[PDB]
């Protein structure tokens, strides 16, 4: 039996408009100047730029000590401790109507699952009830970027999507068949595929809660409608492929 | 055993006013402007259009632009759902402390998923044709209050496959109401309800 | 099955089970019927969204899956079709009319300003017999991912 200590992050500076700075595994992150897309060089016209925290509490740009990058270990971190797994919680929703066909009306409920354990990223992780440092700690970025497309033509769009902003940081010390590309140092999903037998390929959703309301204006008049507004976080899925 | 690649042949994009005799005694239809789902009762603006299951529109009357997608039956090879998660989330808690939570969706991408191309597996009992031409209804209702609604009705017409339709039909709903400027306060005037492209089948 | 109950009365506060002040608040007031509110509209509803008029003798009684094809882009470290899976329960644990609050107070608020919102809140009237958010950022032509002028966000029938 071993007990791990608490952990935290490094208080850092909010990015400056026009700064392109480098994080680990070669992914560059840029805080663009107006008139540019993701790459900050290809021609766009009308995007102005300011970052955002996970929980809707934005950050003033150019501010020292503005965010703490959250912390999460490997899945089953005790099984990588020797060279604490969170579970889903069932829930019930409010009442709702239905309709039934046959070859009738009935009432049921909706169900969602939640997780709140150590593998969830948090600010100040409590203590948890040998391997090296960088093989057990991460830096999930605690600051996301949020893009605005204002391009002429037809039409303007309200494209609300999110993407991380990775910065290296100093992590506090703790007081106590398989493809090789999975268990190497250059895999961000190392902490997700250290033990899964088979190759892993990613799947990406941006679910869009959209709605259609009442009256509109000309272009195709009547319903002239296409717009999509997504959630506040990309939902990345893993898929196990056979290797033999 | 090993099967091969599966698809079907092409079709003709119908013109508005055509109703061909579909399988199992259902008459699919594509009503004109200002008419209901059996083309007899007038209405203000409930007018119908065709889009792909991806949402791509189809110009009517085109030749060989869509093929009905194909899926496999239940236990022809079955698959287990794929886990996943979103990012950090924060909401309020009651007790008689901020806490970070994550919600978990699912996914399925097996042979039962309708596809353009069928990967092989390791005749009327195994293969089928999903209706790849769906009718998008942009129903509008005026008055006090005012809602617009969308319900999807299938166009189940068959192709040719190379060498009981199957229930609780749930339509999940989304709502949004805009408020502007607050002098005159007679009555609120808006709601909405928007279904999915496909029925949630229990 | 549950007994018939008459509709509540405006401006009336009662005491129910577990020491809670169940009441039907007035316009311009919050749930406590003492704290002022701006422009709220308060009606009474069945637990399934259909309205019940007040002053009704025996107004109500009490209570005791897949989708279709969706395209998803694939990034590997391609176009593919996958579906979404939900869950539901319809057993004895599911409340029903025939074999809980059989009425619910509606709080059809509106908050103005910059940004604005519009909140529909449910508060369970109970005389004995995780919140979903279609969240928003609404503006005419500003920088779309900064502080807006308006929003529009339903809260559902009952938070999970």
């Amino acid at each position, epitope marked *: 039996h071993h007990i791990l200590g608490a952990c935290h992050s490094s208080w850092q500076d909010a990015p400056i408009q026009g700064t392109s700075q480098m994080g680990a595994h070669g992914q560059l992150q840029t805080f663009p100047r107006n008139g540019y897309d993701w790459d900050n060089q290809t021609p766009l016209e009308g995007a102005v730029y300011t970052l955002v925290d996970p929980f809707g509490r934005p950050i003033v740009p150019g501010t020292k000590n503005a965010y703490r990058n959250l912390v999460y270990y490997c899945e089953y971190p005790g099984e990588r401790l020797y060279e604490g797994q969170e579970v889903s919680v069932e829930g019930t929703s409010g009442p709702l109507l239905c309709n039934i066909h046959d070859l009738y009306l009935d009432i049921r409920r909706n169900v969602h699952y939640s997780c709140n354990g150590p593998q969830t990223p948090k600010y100040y992780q409590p203590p948890l009830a040998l391997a090296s440092q960088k093989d057990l700690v991460n830096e999930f970025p605690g600051l996301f970027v949020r893009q605005s497309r204002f391009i*002429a033509g037809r039409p303007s769009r309200r494209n609300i999507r999110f993407k991380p902003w990775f910065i290296p940081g100093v992590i506090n010390e703790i007081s106590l068949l398989k493809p090789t590309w999975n268990i190497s140092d250059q895999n961000p999903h190392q902490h997700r595929d250290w033990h899964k037998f088979g190759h892993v390929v990613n799947a990406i959703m941006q679910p869009t809660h959209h709605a259609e309301i009442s009256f509109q204006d000309r272009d195709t008049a009547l319903p002239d409608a296409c717009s999509s507004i997504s959630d506040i976080s990309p939902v990345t899925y893993p898929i196990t492929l056979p290797i033999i | 055993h090993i099967l091969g690649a599966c698809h079907s042949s092409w079709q003709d994009a119908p013109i508005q006013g055509t109703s061909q005799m579909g399988a199992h005694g259902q008459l699919q239809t594509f009503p004109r402007n200002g008419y209901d789902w059996d083309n007899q009762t007038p209405l203000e603006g409930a007018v119908y*259009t065709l889009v792909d299951p991806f949402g791509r529109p189809i110009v009517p009357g085109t030749k060989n632009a869509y093929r009905n997608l194909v899926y496999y039956c239940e236990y022809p090879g079955q698959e287990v759902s794929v886990e996943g998660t979103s990012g950090p989330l924060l909401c309020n808690i009651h007790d008689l402390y901020l806490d970070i939570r994550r919600n978990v969706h699912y996914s399925c991408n097996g042979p039962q998923t309708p596809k353009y191309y069928q990967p092989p597996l390791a005749q009327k009992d195994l293969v089928n044709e999903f209706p790849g031409l769906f009718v998008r209804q*942009s129903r509008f209702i005026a008055g006090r209050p005012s809602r617009r609604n969308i319900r999807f009705k299938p166009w189940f017409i068959p192709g040719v496959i190379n060498e009981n339709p199957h229930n609780a039909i749930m339509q999940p709903t989304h709502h949004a109401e805009i408020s502007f400027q607050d002098r005159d306060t007679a009555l609120p*005037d808006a709601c909405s309800s928007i279904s999915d492209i496909s029925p949630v089948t229990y | 099955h549950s007994s018939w109950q008459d509709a509540p009365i405006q401006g009336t506060s009662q005491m129910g089970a577990h020491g809670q002040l169940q009441t039907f608040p007035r316009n311009g007031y919050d749930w406590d019927n003492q704290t002022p509110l701006e422009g709220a509209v308060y009606t009474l509803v069945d637990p399934f969204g259909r309205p019940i008029v007040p002053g009704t003798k025996n107004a109500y009684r009490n209570l005791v899956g897949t989708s279709g094809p969706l395209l998803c882009n694939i990034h590997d470290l391609y176009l593919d079709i996958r579906r979404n899976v939900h869950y539901s329960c319809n057993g004895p644990q599911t409340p029903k009319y025939y074999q809980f609050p059989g009425l619910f107070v509606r709080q059809s608020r509106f908050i103005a300003g910059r940004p604005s919102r519009r909140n529909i809140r449910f508060k369970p009237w109970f005389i004995p017999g995780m919140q979903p958010t279609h969240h928003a950022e609404i503006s005419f032509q500003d920088r779309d991912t900064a502080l807006p002028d308006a929003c529009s966000s339903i809260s559902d029938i009952s938070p999970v």
Partner: antibody
Framework: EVKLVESGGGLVQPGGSLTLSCVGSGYTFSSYPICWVRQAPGKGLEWLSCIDSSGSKMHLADSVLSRFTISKDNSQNTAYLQMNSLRTEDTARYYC???????????????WGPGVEVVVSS | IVLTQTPLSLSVSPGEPASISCRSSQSLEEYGKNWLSWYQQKPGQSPRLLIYQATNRASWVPERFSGSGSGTDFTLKISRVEAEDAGVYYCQQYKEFPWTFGQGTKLELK
């Protein structure tokens, strides 16, 4: 810089047929509307003629209810305003504008393009 | 529905606020959904956008704009004008079938 690309106009005899173009850039035109905005010279603005977004509802204005067919192409992002039975009334500079919803109201008639002139006479 | 835009001519001193009333002959509904729009000519160029629904600044140009009103009377307010605010201003709405448009009103600098 992103600019509306408008051309294809000219002097057409009455009763004739002409096809215009509203070409945009910097966006995928997968399911997107197009129409024009009329403006008679020295007169207040007005709207002319559309079909629905994928082409379902064919509703026009009062004076133009049977003379205009509107077509686009979802791939090349090039619009077309095809007219028939040309008359003296509809000579105007046509503007290709942007319209959308922000959870259900109008938030844009965003940028009006260069404008090609259709001056007609018998 | 015909919109009533008044007055046609506005003498605007530079810096002073200006008030323009566009009143609808039909009810534009209530505290949620009183709708209108305001577009502006710039002569020699394409006409552009300055105010939405006579409340807030339509374009992302700076804080110098304002607005108020609801119901049937709508007040077009500006806190402090510029030299580029001249032209003719079109109060507009299309929230009903088949089609409506407004008249327009002119701004003059002094």
């Amino acid at each position: 810089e992103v600019k509306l690309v408008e051309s294809g106009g000219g002097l057409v005899q009455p009763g004739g047929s002409l096809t215009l173009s509203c070409v945009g850039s910097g966006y995928t035109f997968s399911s997107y509307p197009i129409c024009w905005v009329r403006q008679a010279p020295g007169k207040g603005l007005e709207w002319l003629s559309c079909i629905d977004s994928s082409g379902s509802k064919m509703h026009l204005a009062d004076s133009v209810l049977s003379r205009f067919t509107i077509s686009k192409d979802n791939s090349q992002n090039t619009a077309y305003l095809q007219m028939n039975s040309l008359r003296t009334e509809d000579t105007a500079r046509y503007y290709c504008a942007r319209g959308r919803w922000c959870y259900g109201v109008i938030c844009d008639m965003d940028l009006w393009g260069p404008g090609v002139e259709v001056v007609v006479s018998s | 529905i015909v919109l009533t835009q008044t007055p046609l001519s506005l003498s605007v001193s530079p810096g002073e606020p200006a008030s323009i009333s566009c009143r609808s002959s039909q009810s534009l509904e209530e505290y949620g959904k009183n709708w209108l729009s305001w577009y502006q000519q710039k002569p020699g160029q394409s006409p552009r956008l300055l105010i939405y629904q006579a409340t807030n600044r339509a374009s992302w140009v700076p804080e110098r704009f304002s607005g108020s009103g609801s119901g049937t009377d709508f007040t077009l307010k500006i806190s402090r004008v510029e030299a580029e605010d001249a032209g003719v201003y079109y109060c507009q709405q299309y929230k009903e079938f088949p089609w409506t448009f407004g008249q327009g009103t002119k701004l003059e600098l002094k």
